[PDB]
Design a protein around this ligand. Structure first.
Ligand code: 0KX
Ligand code: MG
Ligand code: MG
Length: 430
DNA sequence: TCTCACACT
DNA sequence: AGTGTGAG
């Protein structure tokens, strides 16, 4: 009763850019706007691999991971933009710079956790408290929430999309207790007001549209965000959780999309997140471990405590390239040339990073994959990163891996290399 | 057929 | 440390 925590202590949002790399290319090239289009990497093999898809193209069935030649069979008028290539490899600079534009705007509203190139969590608890004081128990107008869905509503005793959205929003607002500044539902609603303002600022100042989720924790905010993408935001209240989870496949929850989620389904013989409530915490810890078990017990009730970490910048800066099939690297000079290419990109990124962000990397991680190996990495080794110098980095990288060459013949390399990866890690202030 | 964070040991 | 999972 009075002592059962409900996980309603924070207001957390997740903002995720819509078809992000496509919007970056559409802003640059107006001819791609409002068209079925996709962003591809590496044009020579089957037209390139698609990594992002506009919503117009998604209507034709175009998806990420399709070859463009194959996407063209579904959507013959599909337009394409190519990722820049530098030093023989895809170069993601344009998208990293565009990400910084967005993350800097979000940071004006609250400390953010950068979760990926195109999304960030926000802890809005303090901002909401501030705004509630300013509001002075005065009602929240639907006009302040023009792109907000309230998950689960309308419900109870119109056939158009926007009509339903308004109907649900009206039911929600009509039920709100605005004279109680500690009401979690009211706190979420003020959170949604702030997120409308944030999303409007991002669109005004960059041209990019995004979606967002507002709830009491990161997992629910992420789940919420995807419910009404694109260009809308979704509020998932604590009360909405039982119905929402009652038919929600386990794999849809962040961190349960892989082997762990598959094991939950298999071991327990369930399908939906809500079905987890029937197990004791000890039962869950017995199957999935102390940490996962406690997390699952709380999460299936809508409760999660993972903090929004104050981190706006990536913790590592890495450069990698695959050399699949018959392209695997088989000579010393080949391996040395490509390590050098990677090291040169890394140096460029590291130097820019040190000037912008007042920090230096101190460890260089080198990873390879040898042909035949079914693992994503064969060998991983680290060494000291003492100077931002590509020739030194590439020579050092070769040293920590040169004993992998099982060829007595010095010039040849065996087994051939199907992947090289260099990553700068362990940053210190500078 | 290119990235980045984090748990385990 | 090095290996692996999970995700954008
Ligand atoms: N496997 C992946 C997933 C994403 N990305 C890139 C391209 C995406 O535009 C960008 C953001 O990923 P995303 O949020 O999963 N999808 P995207 O923003 O394109 O579409 P939405 O579904 O969010 O509207 O990361 C990638 O290069 N490889
Ligand atoms: Mg996105
Ligand atoms: Mg995303």
């Amino acid at each position: 009763g009075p002592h059962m925590a409900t996980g309603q202590d924070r207001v957390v949002a997740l903002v995720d850019m819509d078809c992000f790399f496509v919007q970056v290319e559409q802003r640059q090239n107006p001819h791609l706007r409002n068209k079925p289009c996709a962003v591809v990497q590496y044009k020579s093999w089957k037209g390139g691999g698609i990594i992002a898809v506009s919503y117009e193209a998604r209507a034709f069935g175009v998806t990420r991971s399709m070859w463009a030649d194959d996407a063209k069979k579904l959507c013959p008028d599909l337009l394409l933009a190519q990722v820049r290539e530098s030093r023989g490899k895809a170069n993601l600079t344009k998208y990293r710079e565009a990400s910084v534009e967005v993350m800097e705007i979000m940071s004006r509203f609250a400390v953010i956790e950068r979760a990926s190139i195109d999304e960030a969590y926000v802890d809005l608890t303090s901002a909401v408290q501030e705004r509630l004081q300013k509001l002075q128990g005065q009602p929240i107008s639907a006009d302040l929430l023009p792109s907000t869905y309230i998950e689960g509503l309308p419900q109870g005793p119109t056939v158009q999309k926007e009509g339903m959205r308004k109907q649900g929003l009206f039911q929600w607002l009509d039920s709100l207790q605005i004279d109680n500044l500690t009401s979690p539902d009211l706190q979420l609603t003020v959170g949604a007001v702030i997120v409308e303002e944030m999303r409007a600022a991002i669109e005004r100042e960059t041209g990019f549209q995004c979606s967002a989720g507002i709830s009491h924790n990161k997992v629910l905010a992420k789940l919420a965000c995807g419910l009404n993408k694109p260009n809308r935001q979704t509020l998932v209240s604590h009360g909405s959780v039982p119905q929402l989870f009652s038919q929600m496949p386990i794999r849809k929850i962040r961190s349960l999309g892989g082997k762990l989620g598959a094991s939950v389904i298999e071991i327990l013989g369930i399908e939906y997140m809500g079905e987890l409530t029937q197990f004791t915490e000890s039962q869950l810890q017995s199957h999935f471990g102390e940490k996962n078990g406690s997390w699952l017990y709380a999460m299936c009730r809508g409760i999660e405590h993972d903090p929004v970490k104050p981190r706006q910048l990536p913790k590592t800066i890495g450069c990698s390239k695959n050399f699949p099939g018959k392209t695997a690297l088989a000579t010393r000079e080949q391996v040395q040339w490509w390590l050098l290419q990677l090291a040169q990109e890394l140096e460029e990124r590291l130097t820019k990073d040190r000037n912008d962000n007042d920090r230096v990397a101190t460890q260089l991680v080198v990873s390879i994959r040898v042909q035949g190996d079914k693992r994503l990495s064969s060998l991983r080794r680290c060494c000291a990163l003492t100077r931002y110098d590509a020739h030194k980095m590439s020579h050092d990288a070769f040293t920590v891996i040169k004993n992998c060459n099982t060829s007595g013949i010095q010039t040849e390399w065996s087994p051939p290399l199907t992947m090289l990866f260099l990553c700068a890690t362990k940053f210190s202030a500078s």
